[PDB]
Subunit: 174 residues, 4 copies
């Protein structure tokens, strides 16, 4: 049994809202200096990558600015995906925003942290996620959250994005 | 003296962001549910109203749709003899509406509690939410904003000055001792 | 169909935890001065009163100190209960902690605020509740919360306390 | 110079309060569910351990029950050649346990991230939570504490000094510029 949490229209609005929050918290409207960091979005495959693309694309059209974005494959860091793609310049002294679709256990994000340190040494790392569905197993939290969804362990939350799934949305299932 | 908390750039982006949040939480981007309450913004005079107008218009720039908005004077409800600004309720009233009260700064919460009194003299909303630009802490009542531009730790000896372009000529926030 | 959210033992622990939080936030371990307020707990009948009693009683045994407690009848302020009982000294310049069992709409708390101002003029008002079950209709929030419980509108949350119900606990129903 | 953030009185009460919170969130007051993980506290040396010991013992003073507790040295995992304190894992290990990492102050989060690395070299917990006395903001990693004594806005030029009686002779917290 299915039930929809977020419509296509909700997903798109939520993403633009998140882009605004990123612009605010990372000072992208401000001039630049030691406390305006270079920002890079890295998605966790598969849907995390697409979200990072949608965010980088919203940011650009809202602020005119091109933030680096890419993908961080965590296959080798886990306890047919996109391979790792790091923008030109790398991530040394950058503010990396890790992007994922759903924050559940937090284990995927911990894996991303590990994979990141093989890439280089960011000044800071933040986390943006479309859904936070509780049940953390690690002391992790998202800086930017589309929707907080209370769930039971027997429920599954599924994020659908156009590119992979044909339509945007989020559904809960049992 | 004084330091800039928010630049003009920071103000417009934050107002845009709150408009986005209002759309989400009250469901303007979707076709309107069976018993969804209409949304009405009521500013607290004078800068609350300036903010409400900007939000209404960002909401329409961003999502094309038109929310009722207006002004709720609270002069007589706070703390001379008379109301210093006009109360303006959009057509259709606020009965069974979702009213969002809008102010520049959330401090003690006493202004919002006044506005709850004033609203009750206008009508009977289904629900009341609160949007502010700055929440500066130091609540004296169990009130909080639904929407907040910036949360700003302050000392009781600091002051927060919000400027909005249509009322003040520039956008900005500064804090002074 | 029923299901239990909090056992008797959970309820009692949660109450003592709340008493500790009150001691901390209201400076009852500190000497006294213009920023150590006199504290008074007022319960909203029926179960809110009993909770205020249980809290005042936990505070006393934890810190040795006797905080004023009473009841605030909101019958005349609503949109066979306990009548209003205000401790000696009243509430002028006090820190009043309103106590209720469940925070739902917030309308009961708004009614309490109104009833309070007929009693006198506190320096500040806080709110302590055993359960917050979402679905606010007013911009109100509890300073102290036992359990946050996500609910649907069709669910009912019931707080049971020994004195009224025979055993402590909280149950969700449909 | 320096001002008192927390008196000795404030420290003991706050530690007691966190012990209460740990009991709730991990379910020590109830008869233990079918697949409830056992709870183990691991302090980060040296004051983290002092705090963990106090929590373990408040938890037993308050609820009579005994949680595993110990020390996780992170010397080699942060940032010389060697470990400056001892790692001490209680009998039964941490495999499929609920480990609560305990430290005095949560700042950047880099110490906690080190401790996650160190924990992984000890075993495979089912879950890891974090308790700290003071969270002073300025996170550089997406980490947060499950349990916090006090949230303290700070500037990067301020320092927070936690003193706990068994390690330092008095209980207290001060902040200095």
């Amino acid at each position: 049994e299915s039930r929809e949490l977020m419509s296509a229209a909700n997903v798109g609005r939520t993403i633009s809202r998140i882009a605004h929050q990123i612009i605010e918290k990372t000072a992208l409207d401000d001039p630049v200096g030691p406390d305006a960091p270079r920002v890079v979005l890295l998605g966790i495959p598969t849907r995390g990558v697409t979200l990072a693309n949608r965010l980088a694309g919203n940011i650009t059209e809202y602020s005119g600015i091109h933030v680096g974005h890419g993908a961080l494959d965590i296959t080798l860091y886990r306890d047919p995906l996109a391979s790792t793609s790091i923008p030109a310049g790398g991530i040394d002294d950058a503010l990396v925003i890790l992007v994922d679709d759903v924050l559940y256990s937090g284990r995927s994000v911990r894996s991303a942290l590990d994979a990141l340190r093989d890439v280089g040494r960011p000044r800071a790392v933040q986390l943006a996620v479309l859904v936070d569905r509780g049940h953390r197993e690690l002391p992790l939290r998202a800086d930017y959250v589309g929707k907080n969804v209370p769930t039971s362990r027997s429920e599954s939350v599924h994020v659908r994005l156009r590119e992979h799934d044909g339509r945007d949305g989020v559904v809960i299932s049992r």
